[PDB]
């Protein structure tokens, strides 16, 4: 069903366990992958596992010009995956960086009348969690819907994946897992799976949606 | 990725555009498909096109004993897809919501034993639109509420319960509309274009997969951005 | 601010804790109150406490002709408050959703002429919780969907349609629960405390006001933060 | 029903038409009002209309220390009303300023185990509108829910009012009003009314909610 052959995807925060699960899956589905992030050493070990059809981009999203530059550095771009990511610090990383990445990617994707943007919110935390992470996640979803409407006639979809708890002392766990009906934490591959679907041609009529991958913890 | 080899899926409403698209896709992905519905000739043609790995089940949702009989008479049911019986308030509530609750309850009866299942409820297509007649709107919201509550309650027993909510899906060569009507609907849709049945089918397949395991009680909107949840 | 002088309000379920709290508040604010329900003695006591500006309407929601008869038999109806008949899937769907649709349709019949109305649908209280049994969950989601669709359709004709969704409301001297049960429910509620009927009544009064004119098709959750929409 | 006698409320952006409608209403309901904002001249003309039981605080929210200072300057505070308010500019004004105001107000309100915080999102724009306003509005609501959960046992409620279109060429209007079932724009008094309710004792069991005052334009 899901074939990403011929596509080029860019994954930010590609050395996190979610970032890397996404990178492997999209690569395994035939996408050429641009794995981006600040830890060159970890990106390279990801790269080694990928073997070919990837490129590393050592990048600090915290810097606005570097977000802006990251996308230009790329010629083909069909799929952008923005991983997460002081109130100000979380907002600037989880929301302002992502705006730039999304906007710049849109400018590129408009030229082809094709593209996929998937914004991934950080892992809970934390029912609604700390104000900063909760504000930035919501903000990112509001951002996603808004850009979705804006690029809709031009063949670009913009969607969000909201992971719940992805893999403490036995007290802290009890606490969380009790908020997850399924009764367990998710794994990075659970998020990767949702992302690959939204990044594919089989989700061409899905835009502005947030897809929660959370074990029933939040039902929307 | 979405390999349904050795699985059995039951699709109600299998003769509608969405229904038959779901039937073919789930079959293409390796699943036996119990293709169910009221028009038998329509259902035989689909069957004929499917060729193998199906069973027809002529069936009338309206009959409450016949919904309950539908699920108990299938043996290994891994995946249930309830299509909407929808284009009287009581009537549409009865087919789109009550009917679907027997199907859902009866499927969980079978699935809880096997500790594995997928239930996927599909709301009725948006009409000529988005809030709709009260009765369709009620049943649809209702379906989605039902889907959350069943999701919660089987969530520890390896069954996911999810819904798909299509927008304006074009199933037919002609939609029966004139240009003004058409423009009026297409103005509701950011993508500036209709859904087709395969759009909904792809979403259903995604949820039906083994890898959709951590995804439950969600509504996947396939609607060209006309409604963002 | 919320002056209901010269208005008439009909409250179904007027003998429940929430119902009678709504009845007293809307009366206190100057509205005649058509206090309706099935237990007459309960309803007479409330009436006795109300003293003036009410009418009792013994009535059985279950009867579809009796819901329709309820609204047509009241003359100047400005405000309708439908309380939930809720503590069979079919049954709860029939009282909490179908019943409420006749009431709502029949009220809009009267209100559209006067080009002014308030309709306020109240979902059933959360049970011992939040997603609930499927049947209550379905009807509640369903009610809220109905409320949006009717809201849209009378929105140009000076009628607002809104819902109130309470959480755990304590109405009775004792709740029937033991401490473990109580702690389990109170753990669901950020405020760490129960709703009381007046909480829901205040929300209803807010929506019923002349100044709630631009507010329609909303669900006002009065639930101590247990669910945030 | 709604009596604010004995209370002190602080309204930011108090010289906007929404801000001032809120200030008058809360004052008319018996609240002492602290009317805050950057336009001293306009605040003073608001002040004159109020006549007594108010105080002006000339304040630029754009400055973080000034947000932090605004609340300390106040001894009694039962009710805070945060009016809205470069991607970065809108986020910083409509979301970062509000965080500080909310957090500082919470520190004060914890001491009394009482308080009301109402965050008001900017007027549409714009179905979801520009990405910056849509992101900041969503962010503010996510922020509101998160702080709601955090202060809930301490007698403070935190809620959001989301106005729709509040009072172009005849083309632009046609466009908007078509998105509003009611078929008309709202007035500032419509927002003021919602705020007074949430700010009162009659909304003591309502927290973490967003209340949309929009003519049915968005139903939630």
Gapped junctions in chain D, after residues (C–N > 2.5 Å): 85, 125, 167
Q: Which two tokens stand for residue C79?
A: 């405000």
How many structural domains is chain A composed of? 1
What is the Cα–Cα distance from B3 to A1, expressed in whole angstroms?
9
Query: Is B138 marked within a binding site?
Result: yes
What is the Cα–Cα distance from C156 to C135, expressed in whole angstroms?
33
What is the Cα–Cα distance from B146 to B154, expressed in whole angstroms?
12
Domain assignment of residue B216, given as a range: 1-229
Handedness of CA A69, A74, A76, A81 (dihedral sign): negative
3-class secondary-structure state, position B166: strand
Mutation pick from D205, D214, D220 vs chain C, by most beta carbons of C within 10 Å, is D205
What is the Cα–Cα distance from D12 to D37, expressed in whole angstroms?
6
Residue C149 burial by Cβ neighbours in a 10 Å radius (0-12, 13-18, 19+): buried
Residue B131 burial by Cβ neighbours in a 10 Å radius (0-12, 13-18, 19+): buried
Cβ distance C190 to D153 less than 8 Å, yes or no, reads yes
List CB contacts of B90: < 8 A, sequence separation 6 or more. C98
Alpha helices in chain A (DSSP H): 17-28, 40-50, 64-72, 87-91, 97-112, 131-151, 170-179, 188-199
Q: Which of D139, D30, D169, D10 is nearest to D75 (CA)?
A: D10
Q: Which of D214, D212, D211, D210 is nearest to D181 (CA)?
A: D214
Q: Which of C136, C229, A214, C168 is nearest to B150 (CA)?
A: C136
Question: Please, are residues D43 and D15 in contact by the beta-carbon 8 Å criterion?
Answer: yes
Whether residue A133 lies in the annotated active site: yes
Phi-psi region of D115 (alpha: psi -120 to 50; beta: other; left: phi over 0): left
3-class secondary-structure state, position A108: helix
Q: How many residues comprise chain C? A: 229
The backbone torsions φ and ψ at residue D110, rounded to the nearest 5 degrees and listed phi first, read -55, -40
Paired strand residues for B54 = B33
- How does DSSP classify residue B169? B
3-class secondary-structure state, position A77: coil
The backbone torsions φ and ψ at residue D161, rounded to the nearest 5 degrees and listed phi first, read -110, 130
Count of beta carbons in the 10 Å neighbourhood of residue A125? 14
Output helix, strand, coil percentages for chain B, rounded to the nearest 5: 45, 15, 35
List CB contacts of D127: < 8 A, sequence separation 6 or more. A149, D179
Q: Which of A13, A26, A20, A45 is nearest to A196 (CA)?
A: A26
Q: Which of B14, B75, B78, B4 is nearest to B45 (CA)?
A: B14
List CB contacts of D73: < 8 A, sequence separation 6 or more. D57
Q: Which of D25, D21, D34 is nearest to D4 (CA)?
A: D25
What is the Cα–Cα distance from A94 to A129, expressed in whole angstroms?
15
Cβ distance B191 to A211 less than 8 Å, yes or no, reads no
Question: Please, are residues C194 and C168 in contact by the beta-carbon 8 Å criterion?
Answer: yes
**Axis-axis angle for helices B17-28, B40-50 (nearest 10):** 30
What is the Cα–Cα distance from A27 to D1, expressed in whole angstroms?
63
- CA B41 from chain center: how many Å? 21
Chain A residues inside the 8 Å CB shell of D135: 95, 99, 139-140, 142-143, 146
Handedness of CA D104, D107, D111, D113 (dihedral sign): positive
Residue D172 burial by Cβ neighbours in a 10 Å radius (0-12, 13-18, 19+): exposed
Q: Which two tokens stand for residue B158?
A: 């390896």
What is the Cα–Cα distance from B38 to B23, expressed in whole angstroms?
15
Count of beta carbons in the 10 Å neighbourhood of residue C48? 9
What is the Cα–Cα distance from B140 to B127, expressed in whole angstroms?
13
Alpha helices in C63-133 (DSSP H): 64-72, 89-93, 100-114
Looking at residue C132, which CATH number applies to its domain?
3.40.50.720
Using CA atoms, how far residue A127 sits from A165, A186, C38, D154, in Å, is 10, 16, 41, 18
Q: Search chain A and give the residue with CA nearest D134.
A: A142
Phi-psi region of C118 (alpha: psi -120 to 50; beta: other; left: phi over 0): beta
What is the Cα–Cα distance from C69 to C102, expressed in whole angstroms?
10
Using CA atoms, how far residue C186 sits from C128, C130, C223, D146, in Å, is 10, 12, 11, 19
Q: Which of B221, B208, B217, B128 is nearest to B166 (CA)?
A: B221
Cβ distance A206 to B221 less than 8 Å, yes or no, reads yes
Q: Which two tokens stand for residue D76?
A: 């009694």
Q: Which residues of C touch D (CB under 8 A)?
A: 1-2, 25, 29, 148, 151-152, 155-156, 167, 190-192, 195-196, 199, 202-203, 205-206, 209, 211-225, 228-229
- DSSP-derived secondary structure for C157-190: GTEEEEEEEE-SB--SS--S--HHHHHHHHHT-T
The backbone torsions φ and ψ at residue B221, rounded to the nearest 5 degrees and listed phi first, read -90, 125
Residue B112 burial by Cβ neighbours in a 10 Å radius (0-12, 13-18, 19+): middle
Q: Which two tokens stand for residue B224?
A: 């060209």
Q: Using CB atoms, which residue from C155, C219, C220 is nearest to D181? A: C155
**Axis-axis angle for helices B17-28, B197-208 (nearest 10):** 40
- How does DSSP classify residue B123? P
Q: Which two tokens stand for residue D155?
A: 């007698």
The backbone torsions φ and ψ at residue A15, rounded to the nearest 5 degrees and listed phi first, read -90, -5
Resolution (in Å) of the shown entry? 2.2
Q: Which residue in this structure is represented by tokens 């990511």?
A: A85
Question: Please, are residues A29 and A98 in contact by the beta-carbon 8 Å criterion?
Answer: no
Chain C residues inside the 8 Å CB shell of D1: 1-2, 25, 29, 202, 205
Q: Which two tokens stand for residue B191?
A: 């993508």
Q: Which of A148, A142, A150 is nearest to A121 (CA)?
A: A142
Chains A, D: CB contacts within 8 A come to 93
Cβ distance A190 to B217 less than 8 Å, yes or no, reads no
Question: Please, are residues C130 and C191 in contact by the beta-carbon 8 Å criterion?
Answer: no
Name the minimum distance, in Å, from the CA of C118 to any CA of chain B. Answer: 17
The H or E element that residue A152 is part of is none
Subunits next to D (3 or more Cβ pairs <8 Å) are A, C
Q: Rg (Cα) of chain B, in Å, rounded?
A: 17
């Amino acid at each position: 069903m899901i074939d990403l052959t011929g596509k080029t995807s860019l994954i930010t925060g590609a050395s996190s366990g979610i970032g890397s699960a996404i990178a492997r899956l999209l690569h395994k589905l035939g996408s050429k992958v641009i794995i981006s992030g600040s830890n060159e050493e970890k990106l390279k070990s990801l790269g080694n596992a990928l073997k070919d059809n990837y490129t590393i981009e050592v990048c600090n999203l915290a810097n606005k010009e570097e977000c802006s530059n990251l996308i230009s550095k790329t010629s083909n771009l069909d799929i952008l995956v923005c991983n997460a990511g002081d109130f100000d610090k979380v907002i600037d990383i989880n929301l302002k960086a992502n705006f730039i990445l999304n906007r710049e990617a849109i400018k590129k994707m408009i030229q082809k009348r094709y593209g996929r943007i998937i914004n991934i919110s950080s892992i809970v935390g934390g029912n609604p969690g700390q104000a900063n992470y909760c504000a930035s996640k919501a903000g990112l979803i509001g951002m996603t819907k808004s850009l979705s409407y804006e690029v809709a006639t031009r063949g670009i979809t913009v969607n969000a994946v909201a992971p719940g708890f992805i893999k403490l002392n036995e007290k802290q766990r009890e606490a969380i897992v009790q908020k997850i009906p399924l009764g367990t934490y998710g794994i990075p591959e659970d998020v990767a799976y949702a992302v690959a679907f939204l990044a594919s041609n089989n989700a061409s009529y899905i835009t502005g949606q947030t897809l929660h991958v959370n074990g029933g913890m939040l039902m929307v």
